[PDB]
Design a protein around this nucleic acid. Sequence first.
DNA 1: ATCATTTTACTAACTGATAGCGGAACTTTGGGAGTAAAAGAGTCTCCGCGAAAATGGC
DNA 2: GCCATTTTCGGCCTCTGTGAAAAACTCCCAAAGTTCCGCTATCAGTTAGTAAAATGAT
Lengths: 98, 86, 50, 100, 205, 69, 126, 100, 132, 81
Amino acid sequence: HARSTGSYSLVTQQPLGGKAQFGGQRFGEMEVWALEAYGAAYTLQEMLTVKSDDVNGRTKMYKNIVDGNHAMEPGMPESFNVLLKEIRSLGINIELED
Amino acid sequence: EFDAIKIGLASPDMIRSWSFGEVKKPETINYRTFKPERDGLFCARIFGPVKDYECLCGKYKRLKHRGVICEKCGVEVTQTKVRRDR
Amino acid sequence: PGVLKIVKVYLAVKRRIQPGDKMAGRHGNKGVISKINPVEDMPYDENGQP
Amino acid sequence: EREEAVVWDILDEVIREHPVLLNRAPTLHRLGIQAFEPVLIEGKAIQLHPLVCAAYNADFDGDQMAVHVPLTLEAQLEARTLMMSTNNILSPASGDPIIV
Amino acid sequence: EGNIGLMKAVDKFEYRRGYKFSTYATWWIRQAITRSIADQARTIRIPVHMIETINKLNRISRQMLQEMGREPLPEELAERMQMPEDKIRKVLKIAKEPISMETPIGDDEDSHLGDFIEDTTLELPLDSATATSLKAATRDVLAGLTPREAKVLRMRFGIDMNTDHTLEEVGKQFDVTRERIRQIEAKALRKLRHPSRSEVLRSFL
Amino acid sequence: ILLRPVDDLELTVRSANCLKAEAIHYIGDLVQRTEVELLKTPNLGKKSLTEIKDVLASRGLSLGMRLEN
Amino acid sequence: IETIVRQMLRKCTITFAGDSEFLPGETVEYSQVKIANRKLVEEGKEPARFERELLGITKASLATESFISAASFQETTRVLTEAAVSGKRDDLRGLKENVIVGRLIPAGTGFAYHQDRQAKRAQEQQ
Amino acid sequence: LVPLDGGRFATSDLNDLYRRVINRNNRLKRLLELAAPDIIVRNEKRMLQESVDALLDNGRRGRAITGSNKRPLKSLADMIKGKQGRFRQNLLGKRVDYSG
Amino acid sequence: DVAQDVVVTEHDCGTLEGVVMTPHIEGGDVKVALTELALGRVVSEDILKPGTDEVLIPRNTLLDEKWCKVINDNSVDQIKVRSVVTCDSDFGCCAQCYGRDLARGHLVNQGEAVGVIAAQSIGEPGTQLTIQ
Amino acid sequence: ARVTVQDAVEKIGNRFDLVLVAARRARQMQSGGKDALVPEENDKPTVIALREIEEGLITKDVLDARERQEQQEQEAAELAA
DNA sequence: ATCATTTTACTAACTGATAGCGGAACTTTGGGAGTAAAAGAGTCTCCGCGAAAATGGC
DNA sequence: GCCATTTTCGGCCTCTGTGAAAAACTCCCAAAGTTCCGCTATCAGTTAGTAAAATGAT
Ligand SMILES: [Mg+2]
Ligand SMILES: [Zn+2]
Ligand SMILES: [Zn+2]
């Protein structure tokens, strides 16, 4: 199996799972630990943001690759926004200070 | 963009500040038109339009009317992704 | 309910052996085929049987 | 989609010096994810160097491995400099060679 | 809900009739409970009369299956109900309760149905790149025209502007009338159909 | 730039209308007619001659070039 | 194993309160007490006295200053309730918090980047 | 609440919990409008409290509310917590593109 | 999860504390030698020659194979080396108190997530685990 | 082509700093119009930057110096306008 | 350099069509009130888990 | 200080739709919905006509 871009989850806005759904591989906790041990910060950021759930970031990355500029503009994962909305729904004020 | 995450109790005024409206009915969608019901759990007047730059009426159905609230329904003409934030 | 017509198509696929296929005996010795070597590169006995 | 020959030449030029990431589950230690230079082969199975098998705890009895493509220049250089197999020949747990 | 119905029954009881309280109160309690079930038992609310129609259809289906030993067919149910078959099918297609997204899928327990639902409203990045390329190609092709016809087409189609314009507003800026704008757009379309400057735009079809 | 209609050589309205006399078809025929015929028409003039020769230069040809085709 | 044992020995119970903003019988981080003692010594004021406590890996993990990592580890309900009642602030100083919020981890190639930001912080706070 | 193939609809348990909360709140308002006997009002307030608790954290107060699957409904606390929760299934680990 | 926050943040914290290192003895024979334990550690106080005041190995020097052979030839019994536990760094540890990074062979670089490496190294072999 | 990033880490000292410097150089050569200081030999920008670092032509000092130089030159040119 | 002609730029008009908006009337749907023998305490099954720690009660 | 009841935890990949039961009619009224017709805005298609610019011939 192999996937570059395809369907995405309805809620988490993440690539689906399985060959039947043309889905992508899971970069689990152990993989994140291995990348952190290597010191590979940029590869980890690529997997987290512009490959999984940064809706604007992944589209910008696709356009940039098509036009030759292999650069990314990382954003905020949609999963963190879902977590924020859930915690606010539990009657707890969680907010990002600036 | 942000340097810290602050947690704490939520005041009723803060909860009202978050909210874009009050859900008054347990209705979700019509059983025939499959459209959101007013003042329900899926209301387009509170949470946003179901189609991009459209209103439930269909009167405002293009981008020139962005940010305009339809008088017949009250649905703001904007993107559907606001239904993930509102 | 709501279904008008169902058309089912049956496809027969001939799958040949290739590298990556799992082959095993009856004694727990399983393996994955690594190379499809030519006949001339196989070991052969005194009678020429590879 | 039509799979022309010039497309194959373009693919060969694309992956020339583009590192690729190979990962085997479970990733007990950081040696379970490494960077390699791809070589196009005719088949459907990933060909792996024997000497990294001890690093991957991998044997060829039905094992499957996942592959990832670093996109940005920073990620490619991270794979080439830190995560390449030629750099990871000492065990971080003890310092003894791992490609024995 | 039965307590509310009992309150109503108390509010409109008559002891002069000589009947016991339970006789009158049971009707109101049953009405309240049945109406509450019809109104608040489904995620997608079905009106009360349609709920009664579904229930009576189920009762007749039960009786007919008992009578003949097999599942009644839509036509026979329509004949027995003295109702059109199309209405029977319409009623049969709406008696479904939504399935939960947390239901385990297959024989597994850590997998859920909600992980297999796509986001069909999303735009594929290939489509967005094609849109950007089409914008660039349209700009390049329109740059090969005189400013008059290029801007006439731009304003008549809304390219690089918020709103589309009819012939009158296009004519007003040029101070010319509508018919000249129409033939200007016709000339631009005829010129852009020439294959000398339309091969790049053809690949988008 | 083999045998293809004369509309493809993007000729102006007057140029095309004049040559619309059916005294030509396909650019292979046009390249062979020389200035003798090109200026013979009372409607093909100096500017039309220059424009046609510029189009043929874009085609890499000169008016009057002799080819067996 | 010594990098694990150091993580175990991260808390201290205050024995002598001193003039620092610490109460007797309070379990607080050792680094904060060390900085407070250095500041008090520079100010010529009575420093604090602490008794270091040994905690298991689970209790030390759940006793971190950042509540995002503690919630992500386990027992999200207790961590979130305590953070909400206390009004805690997450400064995003570890790997897990930056992974969750999608920023560069303060390890390896992100280290200098994070360092730069901290410098700017101080320079603006001036 | 999105349609599946065949006309079926897929819904989250949060919809059911919110519907229960809204129904009980509206019933409480109607009872207070009718000058109800005290016992019914106390029962309605208990039901409202139970619905809110089930919406926030199901099973902590008492018997977990179950739907038409004879299985407990998933609340916000269950959605943010656990091995299958958001933190460990979607934040610390993700499914990625450009992978095989 | 308990060691993810340990990152090498400085080069030297300027501390004089350290841990004592001697060959591990469990009877009449050695179990592990001093060379194995001292390989890759930074010296805390000078390794004086036995019965002599000559500074054989000065302070703040990594013990590589050459100095390990030197120590073995001199027959030095007890030494003192810097340790992560005794580090004075406010956040994380310093390069000298950690020592050689085993996966590279040189002194540990700035920004190395040594805690994750330590946790993985300890946890990976868990499957293999069960007077004269 | 090149393998075994040894010479580069010897010239730089830290692998992460080397990665950052090589990334900056590769971005300059790819996105920008900057040309390579060594024969390309059909190599990708990352490999060319790594080779330049190995040869000692590119360090952090050089990159920051010429970047400040470009800012100064652009300021002077805008003043000239 | 100058004249005569074709093409160009700009008005008007007719044909024919099509989509959108508003009003009248009819059928379909949807919400609500009412039902008078009397009937006047729930489920609802399970429970095949162990080990360690954090809170009340005395 | 010591029981005694709660609380929370239990490895990483890949495929892999479910659930299925369950009990009312009847009458009245207003609003949404379907269909039809008329008026109006807008446009594609075509022709004619007039005044002027481009252009070729001399
Ligand atoms: Mg195996
Ligand atoms: Zn509207
Ligand atoms: Zn130190």
